[PDB]
Symmetry: C3
Subunit: 152 residues, 3 copies
């Protein structure tokens, strides 16, 4: 997953960013045992008078946008749950500190994606589980792993 979090300048401490990115990472670990390092969160500090909401500068506004690449969400229930859990993780850092905020997700093609130059392994495959356990992208025989994964 690819997350962008646009904040008022200096809204979050380094410890805040660690804690919040950990919470966001836990979504994908807990619900789909994704390798932790798949989860990328980019914090973007926005200076005053750079975020305009409804045509007026808003310096108390956090805008979040994310791509999902590894998995598709194929039912209304699963899609609603993703939004529900995302807001649950964000609330201690954003809602509960009095910020205004908005979030949206896009789904992008799984096959147009490389990490450390490698083809990520198939969902729920042994190699994906290995990548998760090691928490690093391990070079592997893509065809061999795909073949065995298809016969699971």
């Amino acid at each position: 997953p690819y997350w962008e979090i646009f904040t008022p300048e200096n809204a979050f401490t380094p410890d805040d960013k660690e804690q919040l990115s950990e919470a966001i990472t836990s979504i994908y670990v807990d619900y789909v045992n994704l390798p932790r390092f798949y989860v990328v969160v980019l914090f973007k500090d926005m200076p005053k008078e750079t975020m305009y909401v409804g045509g007026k500068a808003n310096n108390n506004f956090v805008r979040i946008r994310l791509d999902h690449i590894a998995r598709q969400m194929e039912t209304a229930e699963v899609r609603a749950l993703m939004m529900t859990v995302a807001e649950e993780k964000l609330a201690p850092f954003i809602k509960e500190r009095g910020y205004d905020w908005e979030i949206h997700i896009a789904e992008t093609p799984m096959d147009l994606w490389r990490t450390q130059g490698l083809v990520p392994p198939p969902p729920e495959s042994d190699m994906e589980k290995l990548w998760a356990k090691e928490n690093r992208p391990i070079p592997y025989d893509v065809a061999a792993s795909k073949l065995a994964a298809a016969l699971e």
Copy 2:
């Protein structure tokens, strides 16, 4: 709508940004009666030698990218009209100030979107009109709103 406008450093004053983001907001207020606060415009100053066009730095280039989330544009005519009006609103600040520029839109799924943690109301619904009038996201019974709006 989620707009990113990448500009040369110090291209726009705060007054500029207010007026341009106001012009952009007016597109959605006027044409589709969207709540103003849905329209988010992020101005991103780009230092010299950070925007490369055709392999060469262009320090006089404004790049615009937007996501449309709330509605889909379903006909060629409506889609063309959006591009035309966007260019109209941008021209006084960008084209007419001598910049080179480029713009594109992506459309993203309506059901993967929350404002203030809330599910936004149906297009053209009473709750959406209420959200526009109050210009804030009002907690409401989503199913009750969807029900009455359908009827």
Copy 3:
């Protein structure tokens, strides 16, 4: 094509950026005959403690994202080729300099895109070839060009 390259601060010099964006541009020129100026690369310096990978800051990490607008890649083989060649162009600047890195592509609708306020010509069309030769967006009659292209 619209590339974003998020890097640690001061990772790349302007000459690095020229060379790398030239390599990226060459992909589209060589394989698709696209006008050079379609290829936009935005370099974004990211301070320490702003890129978090698996819940921990990675201050040695380059993240690349691109939109493809002017072409759709319709077969598995072409799509794999795109990724392979992208990595080949990136390697001297990123992999071989010891960075960790990740890249992905989205495809966005071709009709919601303007450059210099103009409708870009159709893929492989004569007007596209003219735009490529001149390396600038040339105003043209959209209907007149489409009329001749049909014959």
